[PDB]
Amino acid sequence: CPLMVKVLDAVRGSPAINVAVHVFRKAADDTWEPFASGKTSESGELHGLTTEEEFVEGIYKVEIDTKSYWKALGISPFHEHAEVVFTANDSGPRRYTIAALLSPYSYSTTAVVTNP
Amino acid sequence: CPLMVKVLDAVRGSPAINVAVHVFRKAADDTWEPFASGKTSESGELHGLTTEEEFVEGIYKVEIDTKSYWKALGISPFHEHAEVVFTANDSGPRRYTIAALLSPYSYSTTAVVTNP
Amino acid sequence: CPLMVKVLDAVRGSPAINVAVHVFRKAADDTWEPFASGKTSESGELHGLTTEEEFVEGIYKVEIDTKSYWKALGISPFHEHAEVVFTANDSGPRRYTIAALLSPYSYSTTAVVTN
Amino acid sequence: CPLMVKVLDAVRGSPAINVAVHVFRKAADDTWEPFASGKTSESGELHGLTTEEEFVEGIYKVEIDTKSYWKALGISPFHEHAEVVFTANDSGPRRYTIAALLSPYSYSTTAVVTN
Numbered sequence A, B: 001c002p003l004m005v006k007v008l009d010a011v012r013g014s015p016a017i018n019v020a021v022h023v024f025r026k027a028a029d030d031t032w033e034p035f036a037s038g039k040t041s042e043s044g045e046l047h048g049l050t051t052e053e054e055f056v057e058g059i060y061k062v063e064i065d066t067k068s069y070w071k072a073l074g075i076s077p078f079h080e081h082a083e084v085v086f087t088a089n090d091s092g093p094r095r096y097t098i099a100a101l102l103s104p105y106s107y108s109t110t111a112v113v114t115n116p
Numbered sequence C, D: 001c002p003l004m005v006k007v008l009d010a011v012r013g014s015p016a017i018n019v020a021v022h023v024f025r026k027a028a029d030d031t032w033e034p035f036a037s038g039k040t041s042e043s044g045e046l047h048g049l050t051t052e053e054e055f056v057e058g059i060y061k062v063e064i065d066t067k068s069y070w071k072a073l074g075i076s077p078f079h080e081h082a083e084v085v086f087t088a089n090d091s092g093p094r095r096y097t098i099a100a101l102l103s104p105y106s107y108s109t110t111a112v113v114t115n
């Protein structure tokens, strides 16, 4: 519930299904520790990444594997991935949705942050 | 169910709440006939605009009143509105989501079209 | 020089070349009167639309013929066109650039207003 | 000339001026080595990053320091930075422009790859 990812396809006008997403958290030593991962559903959504307990304050990186998606539709895209890096939960727990809209040579991302 | 509008605020990182939306349909005489209207909810969504019966084939215009939103947050924006114009249901009934992401000097829009 | 339009293609990663663009000014009776038009260049730009003398405060609509663009590339598009509607205000900077980034089911637009 | 970066501000409708940009090339051991950097100009552009000789095929990362930008304007931002990661491929056009459109909780990026 606290971290959700939504991915849309701007070419097809559809959810981007079966998109791999990897989440990292910056460790004390400044390396990126694996935090969670998953694949978007048939609605382009990925829930279930983490729990309120696990999702502590920190700097998080959400890596959306856009290059496998375009190639596994038969398209050679420009970007390797879309990376979204942000500090989370630094004034207490929030719920974050990271949304991404994909084209072969472009993407946009936005965050929706709500306080439960 | 067949036509939904979702509006997000890129400054606040939130749904864009209480955004007025007007939908028009192009008439035989090439004028824009009022079709439906409403306001986004606290989740930035507007459902209930039309029914499968009412939502026939045609050219539709979804006008999102972005200028009242920015001003009624105390911001003077650039655009008068965001207009999304498209042919609908021309190969049979589809479900359309029109999404818009707003900034004072910019917006983006995408469509998600699904076949029930 | 006061009004320029820049159009980009998010599918091919290129300027959107030979796109028709029509500019309208809102008239007293709430109708849209033709103001300027042209086709984007090889760099996706359209210059020469108006002059400082002609470009007075008011409500303008920039209609980009995205459907013809995508059709000419063999790609099925969603929108009839992209329309960007804005007020020109003399209290703000002098030169307006209307930029649009096109995909078949999506577009993005922004204004760069500079002195 | 082969690599340019353009940054725009969607809140103010202007170029994003004096934004720090760092470019990295991926090394054999999967680490990111510094390649080029600078600050955007008054037109939101950064030229002069590299030369044709230096800019070989590979994986590049363009990190835009969006958080400092927004802080200097007094605006609370979401992202630490914006990172654009791509492969340079010689089979495609010669000149790369990486464009980014910034908002406090969102950004858009596109590539314009031309000859």
Ligand SMILES: CCOc1ccccc1-c1nc(-c2ccncc2)no1
Binding pocket: A006, A008, A097, A098, A099, A100, A101, A108, A110, A112, B006, B008, B097, B099, B100, B101, B108, B109, B110, C106
């Ligand atoms: C939290 C975002 O959730 C959504 C949920 C349902 C449908 C769409 C979205 C969504 N739309 C956009 C959007 C992307 C590009 N241009 C305009 C809008 N980003 O996310």
Ligand SMILES: CCOc1ccccc1-c1nc(-c2ccncc2)no1
Binding pocket: C006, C008, C097, C099, C100, C101, C108, C110, C112, D006, D097, D099, D100, D101, D108, D109, D110
């Ligand atoms: C003001 C002229 O604009 C430009 C001039 C030169 C090159 C590129 C651009 C440009 N990039 C974008 C853009 C839009 C949405 N997401 C990312 C980028 N819009 O315009």
